[PDB]
From Swiss-Prot, chains A, B:
Chain ranges of the HTH dtxR-type domain: 1-62
Subcellular location(s) per record: Cytoplasm
Positions bound to Mn(2+) 2: 10, 76, 98, 101
Family, as annotated: Belongs to the DtxR/MntR family.
Gene: mntR
Protein name, per record: HTH-type transcriptional regulator MntR
Tree of life domain: Bacteria
Organism of this sequence: Bacillus subtilis (strain 168)
Keywords: Activator, Cadmium, Cytoplasm, DNA-binding, Manganese, Metal-binding, Repressor, Transcription, Transcription regulation
Length: 133, 133
């Protein structure tokens, strides 16, 4: 998966979970992309077997698509939590995560996860960190 | 500056500091790039006034090029220190930093810097973090 591919699967996952389906119109709006570009990507993902097209619904995710999707959602969520814990401007967190999410090994994600846990279990660690700012 | 542009300036800075000059041969080898691609980039950076060409030397950095270069070197160094502190596999740190460095605001770098300081001033914080792993 490329960065674009990962953003599409993650965005299709978010849509099924929150609403109940993925149509190309919703993808185009959400991702800030042209509708025909979504078509060419849906093709790639279908052939690479990340998704199926159901007839009177829209895009459904395969078994593989859903495993990848949930992993992508988790990663984005953790990175946001991480930048929020460390004190990054709220306005900047989403732009940072949008870019950095594709360029970290899972080993880094594993370790960022442990770092989040470190701060979550003792509030005094967070206060100490914030005193340095 | 694009990601490629930032990698070129940072790599030209590292070369002047460590050796004494930047030639295109050294850039091509270091960046894993074709020699004629370096030429087309040196052109961009010259026109955008990040570097000059001195006659019996090679690429020298402008005033602007050196300010940017040192900022890029600092950022890469801090991110490595950061991933090292959090326990990322040594083999993976450089690949992660190579990618993520271009997609973080300075506000994030400022805050990662404070996080590094947090761990550097009390060794017990590091031990606590490592016990979670
Ligand atoms: Mn994303
Ligand atoms: Mn993204
Ligand atoms: Mn670099
Ligand atoms: Mn890079």
């Amino acid at each position: 998966t490329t960065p674009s591919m990962e953003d599409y699967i993650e965005q299709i996952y978010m849509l099924i979970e929150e609403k109940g389906y993925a149509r190309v119109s919703d993808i185009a709006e959400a991702l800030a992309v042209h509708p025909s570009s979504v078509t060419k990507m849906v093709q790639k993902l279908d052939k690479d077997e990340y998704l199926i097209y159901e007839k009177y619904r829209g895009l459904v995710l395969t078994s593989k698509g859903k495993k990848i999707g949930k992993r992508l959602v988790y990663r984005a969520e953790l990175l946001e939590q991480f930048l929020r814990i460390i004190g990054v401007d709220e306005e900047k967190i989403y732009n940072d995560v949008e870019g950095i999410e594709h360029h970290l090994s899972w080993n880094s994600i594993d370790r960022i996860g442990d770092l989040v846990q470190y701060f979550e279990e003792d509030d005094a660690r967070k206060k100490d960190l914030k005193s340095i700012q």
